[PDB]
């Protein structure tokens, strides 16, 4: 009931037996013959890239609004998977985002953990455009805001419109999980590869966005540690590439 | 595995193309602008000429379509109540009576097939079979017209398709009506032999293969120069 | 037990919609109002944009219909006896020759499919298949156009459907005829993937997803207030 998961000869994550969300209903898989357009063979690096990339922990404070990571840029420096983003041209990968919190029984709160495919984001100034430096950092989260952002080339980071101009309660349409600290502790979503082409270049394109939004805010009394660490762990699935070359970009 | 039906000979040489735009009036003056005339040759239009000249020997039926739009001429003595315009399009089969001008007997010749078409409905269409003593048309002819190697270098060959003549049938006295003909020629059931290289030099006239010496290809920076190497970024470095 | 065929994806996204109304004259002046032009995009019309933006990836054929009504312009030198108006509607396939103005060679290009339509009968119709290098169109694109993350945030994507250009075929000298085109676009065989939430904020421009922060919903009297409790009657008391 405290079963350990070992993925590759480097990683150990301890976890109890809970519920998973599998994509839009499909497991990640390898490309078959009547699915690709490229003129070569994939040569998938299964022997080295399937492991757990535990990112840094964020602190869910009382006055926090939400965080998002854009993928696959969220593993740009994470080990050999970041090297394959350099020394290739096309790529195709599913992921198994595992999100878990360490709260006591005297804490309360609720999170919504969404995976949004093609989460294109609007700018904080109309009649203007975003830059790539405001969409995502390479490994750290980007914070939503309670009030209105007002920059020139930034993102409209207000929290109830989710950066996309929609209702934040309707993000339940995409693959999601609720971390309710009363009963739930962890959340694990298995995203497949969703695109309109069989393989894309994973520098320009952002495949999906992982958003973690607190709907019921964190409350605690005065004895308690005044934050709850949220730890995200991403494991790539069935990664395969094409176009061996040097690191042309970055 | 894709499909190759887009580049078959039927799908490459069978598209309708406007090959001739002329105009013809309906009242007197000189006896030349009262009718239109087009000798059927695939050499006056360069775009279609280059596609046909990828082959030496061709064999096809014709599918000719006529888009006739008329108008009322300005000036005094206007058309006023004009009832409806009828047009005669005559196909003179090769070696057939050819009209010198309007109101000639050639128009009333039974031998030359004709279409009587009234304005306001679908355009006029006709189909002509493969009309040749030979067994194919030839885009090229390395030879002469007479047996003594005398005459013109490949112009009196049996590659004659005929003529097309169009006039107004009406007898309109008051007012002039100027019509404009558009010929949309199209080959059907094309069979092509002996593929030839695509032409490099531009054409000079539609009776020859004459040309000016042009370069094999465009200028390049150097013997080994690739273009615009990616400037150092955060991935290409 | 009722039926759910009214809310299938075909019955929800396949209705004809007027997406573009333009006008084009038939006589000279500036060389811009003599023809019409519409780049085929489902973003200029907000009502249809919101229905398409309930999905991330779409795949459909097009069914475009053109409602062309002309009129006679006022002033001197009137049309008088105008015979019949013929109009050319040209679909420039993506990456195809595009007309700079009227009487250009792009109009006579064989590559761009065209319809010649005469006034007084049923409207002109054409069907365009799914034309993309990709395997679907994308309503959203979280990415960039160049490989270096440079350019515009999702505008040069392979979501190009082409253009539609309309002009008068006639050569009308006296009088001007002003026609008005209505484009009734309709998708056929729609297949849609990855449902997205319906948009809350209003749109600002048809190249972005930019927005202003709007309320989640409308104002209400209080946290627990039902509306207009029935006033005491002889049953409700």
């Amino acid at each position: 009931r405290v079963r350990s998961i070992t993925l590759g000869n480097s990683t150990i994550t301890t976890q109890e037996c809970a519920n998973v969300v599998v994509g839009y209903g499909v497991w990640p898989s390898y490309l078959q013959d009547n699915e690709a357009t490229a003129e070569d063979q994939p040569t998938q690096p299964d022997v080295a890239t399937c492991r757990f990339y535990t990112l840094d922990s964020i602190q869910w404070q009382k006055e926090s609004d939400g965080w998002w990571w854009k993928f696959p840029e969220a593993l740009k420096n994470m080990g050999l998977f970041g090297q394959n983003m350099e020394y290739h041209y096309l790529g195709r990968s599913g992921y198994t985002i595992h999100v878990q919190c360490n709260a006591s029984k005297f804490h309360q709160g609720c999170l919504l953990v969404v995976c949004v495919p093609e989460a294109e984001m609007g700018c904080s100034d109309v009649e203007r455009e975003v830059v790539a430096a405001s969409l995502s950092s390479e490994d750290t989260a980007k914070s939503f805001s309670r009030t209105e952002s007002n920059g020139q080339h930034t993102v409209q980071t207000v929290v109830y419109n989710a950066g996309m101009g929609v209702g934040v309660g309707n993000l339940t349409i995409f693959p999601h999980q609720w971390i309710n600290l009363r009963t739930n502790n962890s959340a694990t979503i298995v995203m497949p590869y969703i695109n309109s082409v069989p393989m894309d270049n994973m520098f320009r394109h952002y495949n999906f966005t992982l958003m973690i939004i607190p709907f019921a805010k964190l409350e605690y009394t005065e004895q308690a540690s005044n934050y709850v660490p949220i730890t995200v762990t991403v494991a790539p699935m069935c990664a395969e590439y094409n176009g061996l070359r040097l690191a042309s970009h970055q | 595995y894709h499909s190759r039906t887009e580049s078959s000979i039927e799908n490459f040489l069978c598209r309708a193309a406007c090959v001739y735009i002329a105009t013809y009036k309906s009242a007197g003056g000189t006896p030349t602008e009262r009718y239109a005339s087009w000798r059927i040759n695939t050499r006056q239009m360069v775009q279609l000429r280059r596609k046909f000249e990828l082959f030496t020997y061709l064999r096809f039926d014709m599918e000719i379509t006529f888009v006739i739009t008329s108008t009322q001429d300005p000036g005094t003595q206007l058309a006023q109540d004009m009832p409806v315009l009828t047009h005669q399009i005559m196909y003179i089969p090769p070696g057939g009576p050819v009209p010198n001008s309007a109101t000639d007997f050639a128009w009333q010749s039974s031998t030359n097939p004709s279409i009587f078409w009234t304005e306001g409905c679908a355009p006029a269409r006709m189909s002509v079979p493969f009309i040749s003593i030979g067994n194919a048309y030839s885009n090229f002819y390395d030879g002469w017209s007479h047996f003594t190697q005398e005459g013109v270098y490949g112009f009196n060959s049996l590659n004659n398709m005929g003529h097309i003549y169009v006039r107004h049938v009406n007898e309109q006295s008051l007012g002039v009506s100027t019509s404009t003909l558009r010929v949309y020629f199209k080959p059907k059931h094309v069979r092509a032999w002996v593929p030839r290289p695509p032409r490099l030099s531009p054409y000079v006239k539609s009776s020859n293969v004459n040309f000016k010496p042009t370069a094999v290809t465009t200028e390049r920076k150097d013997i080994n120069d690739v273009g615009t190497l990616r400037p150092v970024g955060y991935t290409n470095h | 037990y009722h039926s759910r065929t009214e809310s299938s994806i075909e019955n929800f996204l396949c209705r004809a919609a007027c997406v573009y109304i333009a006008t084009y004259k038939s006589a000279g002046g500036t060389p811009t109002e003599r023809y019409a032009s519409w780049r085929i995009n489902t973003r200029q019309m907000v009502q249809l944009r919101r229905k398409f933006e309930l999905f991330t990836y779409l795949r459909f054929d097009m069914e475009i219909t053109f409602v062309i009504t002309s009129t006679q312009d006022p002033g001197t030198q009137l049309a008088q006896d105008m015979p019949v108006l013929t109009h050319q509607i040209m679909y420039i396939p993506p990456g195809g020759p595009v007309p700079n103005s009227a009487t250009d060679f792009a109009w006579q290009s064989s590559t761009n499919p065209s319809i010649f339509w005469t006034e007084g009968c049923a409207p002109a119709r054409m069907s365009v298949p799914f034309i993309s290098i990709g395997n679907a169109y994308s309503n959203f694109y979280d990415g960039w156009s160049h490989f270096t993350q440079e350019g515009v945030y999702g505008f040069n994507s392979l979501n190009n459907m082409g253009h539609i250009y309309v002009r008068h075929v006639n050569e009308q000298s006296l009088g001007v005829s002003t026609s008005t085109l209505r484009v009734y676009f309709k998708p056929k065989h729609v297949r849609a993937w990855v449902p997205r939430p319906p948009r809350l904020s209003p749109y600002v421009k048809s190249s972005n997803v930019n927005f202003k922060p709007t309320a989640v919903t409308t104002e209400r009297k209080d946290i627990n207030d039902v509306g207009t409790l029935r006033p005491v009657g002889y049953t409700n008391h």
Epitope: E138, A247, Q250 | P231, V232, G233, Y234 | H146, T148
Partner: antibody, heavy 112, light 114 residues
Framework: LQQSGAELARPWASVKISCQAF???????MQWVKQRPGQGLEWIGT????????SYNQRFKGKATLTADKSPSTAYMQLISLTSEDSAGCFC??????????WGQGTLVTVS | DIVMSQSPSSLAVSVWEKVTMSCKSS????????????LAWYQQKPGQSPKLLIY???TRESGVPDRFTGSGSGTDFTLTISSVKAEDLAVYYC?????????FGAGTKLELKR
């Protein structure tokens, strides 16, 4: 922003120059330029820490070695077989692939 | 190697005289992804370390006047100096971001004439 203090060297020997950057060494490499008072600026090389790459101009290959560690966060350049032609002011600069930005000061190498 | 030319190599000018200076590249330092020229302009004060003047060949820096403005595209550029003052007498070096050997230009020495 910081550079080594003025030092006196001997020909046919090596010199180690230091550079101190307050900014974290990520996504952008450390520039090295050699200034000739008679002529202009000359690039020596850059060591890009974000991907860890090390590169030099052909002229300086075999002359300059570029080495940047993580915990010290100081960039170093070493030159060897010094001659009078190496006496010059050497600057270290940053590059976020957006600009060469600024350089700062630098000890005047004085081979004597 | 991409070389950067500068013409004139130096010129002496008085006060309140609009001066320019060209920096022509042996290769067009303009790529077709963002259309942003890769050229840098630099002022090395007499006996001083150089500072930035114009980056992206188009944009100014802070504490810099409108008598320093980038101008050009492709492979030919210049830096318009509109109203010269007593802080422009120095040597100026252009530079390119494009080819990895980041060579600077010849170096214009804007001289002061009294």
């Amino acid at each position: 922003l910081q550079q080594s203090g003025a030092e006196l060297a001997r020909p046919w020997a090596s010199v180690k120059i230091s550079c101190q950057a307050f900014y974290t060494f990520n996504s952008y490499g450390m520039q090295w330029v050699k200034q000739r008072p008679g002529q202009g600026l000359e690039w020596i090389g850059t060591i890009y820490p974000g991907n860890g790459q090390t590169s030099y101009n052909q002229r300086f290959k075999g002359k300059a070695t570029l080495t940047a560690d993580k915990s010290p966060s100081t960039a170093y350049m070493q030159l060897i077989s010094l001659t009078s032609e190496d006496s010059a002011g050497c600057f270290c600069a940053v590059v976020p692939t957006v600009d060469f930005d600024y350089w700062g000061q630098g000890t005047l190498v004085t081979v004597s | 190697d991409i070389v950067m030319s500068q013409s004139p190599s130096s010129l002496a000018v008085s006060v309140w005289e609009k001066v320019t200076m060209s920096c022509k590249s042996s290769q067009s330092l303009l790529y077709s992804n963002t259309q942003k020229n890769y050229l840098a302009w630099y002022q090395q004060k007499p006996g001083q370390s150089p500072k930035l003047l114009i980056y992206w060949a188009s944009t100014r820096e802070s504490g810099v006047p409108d008598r320093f403005t980038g101008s050009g595209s492709g492979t030919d550029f210049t830096l318009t100096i509109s109203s010269v003052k007593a802080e422009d007498l120095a040597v100026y070096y252009c530079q390119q971001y494009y080819s990895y050997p980041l060579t600077f230009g010849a170096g214009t020495k804007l001289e002061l004439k009294r």
